[PDB]
Amino acid sequence: AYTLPQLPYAYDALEPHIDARTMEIHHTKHHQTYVDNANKALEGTEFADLPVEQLIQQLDRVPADKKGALRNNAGGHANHSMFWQIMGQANQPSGELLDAINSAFGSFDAFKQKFEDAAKTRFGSGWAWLVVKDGKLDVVSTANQDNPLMGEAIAGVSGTPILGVDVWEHAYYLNYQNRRPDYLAAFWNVVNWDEVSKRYAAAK
Amino acid sequence: AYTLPQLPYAYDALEPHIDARTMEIHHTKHHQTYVDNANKALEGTEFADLPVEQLIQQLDRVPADKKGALRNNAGGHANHSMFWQIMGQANQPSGELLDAINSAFGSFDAFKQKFEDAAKTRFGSGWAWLVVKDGKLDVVSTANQDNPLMGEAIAGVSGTPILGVDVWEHAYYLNYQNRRPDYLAAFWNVVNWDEVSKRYAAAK
Ligand SMILES: [Mn+2]
Ligand SMILES: [Mn+2]
DSSP states (O other): OOOOOOOSSOTTTTTTTSOHHHHHHIIIIIIHHHHHHHHHHHTTSTTTTSOHHHHTTOGGGSOTTTHHHHHHHHHHHHHHHHHHHTBOOOOOOOHHHHHHHHHHHSSHHHHHHHHHHHHHHOOSSEEEEEEEETTEEEEEEEETTOOGGGOHHHHSOOSEEEEEEEOSGGGTHHHHTTOHHHHHHHHGGGBOHHHHHHHHHHHO | OOOOOOOSSOTTTTTTTSOHHHHHHIIIIIIHHHHHHHHHHHTTSTTTTSOHHHHTTOTTTSOGGGHHHHHHHHHHHHHHHHHHHTBOOOOOOOHHHHHHHHHHHSSHHHHHHHHHHHHHHOOSSEEEEEEEETTEEEEEEEETTOOGGGOHHHHSOOSEEEEEEEOSGGGTHHHHTTOHHHHHHHHGGGBOHHHHHHHHHHHO
């Protein structure tokens, strides 16, 4: 019941910041694998009809033998699905999103630093996120394919994510090798703040 | 305290199974970073002089605030140090190690399938290991830089590792990209079974 989404842009649209080969393998190999394995785990359950963002808020009610596979693979599908949409071909937010950033973090610059720190500090595989929690913004990180929508019990953090960065080594190894900070610096050039703004509006 | 060990062979000695560029980055960048961060954590403590494989067996004795840094960083140093030594330039074990493999797994071919399965199913970053536990061989995996020497409470598995394979994406992405199974198949060509036999003798 899940399918791989098409990207909103061509595989080379984000060069030189994110290389075309990475975009192609990340989408057509990594993300495809999560969709396929999530579908396998959903076979013959009552959950095969739920949108993926709703399924991952309900992991405590799936059968115990399928919890891990669904956490990992539905999590992977939800996470990559959002990631493609929040990127696009002095890039900064505006309007009420900028105001909420100023309020929570002091400035856009201070926000970038907190976000990069969270991404750099995540040991092994995972993601860093900007989330809305009780109408306020915060920066959290998760392991592997965990997503703050899963809740504190599972993911260790909570909130509705409106922006995320993938720091699995597959997201940056071909262009940046070990240099995660360089990848994070380039990432700011490709964030679609219009899309993040839309997500913020719908999260409060 | 700790220092980065010299490799027992040139960076290009394992071609074409593992590429020279990866060997260089894996050693001088990734492994160096674990050494540096472990040294920072161990400064001016009674623990700074212990061999690393002894330290990771005693993580319960260290100050509570240093446990996390040492698990990740002394773990990474211990893991990579062993990794370089168990590779060298069809390849299979002999003698009493081969007999032990036959006894525990049925055959060397059956052991390879079990080891590859453990390494394939480790989600995210980690390692797969052949361990000796109560005189018998078994195959286990660990997350991130955990090592079975840390014990079941920390690593979730136990035993003395005699062979391990790194399945962090940095270990294989440049040459294999998403194809972790092709990397594992290549890895059999570079195992130094004489060294593994040595470790088996010491651990039994
Ligand atoms: Mn990814
Ligand atoms: Mn490694």
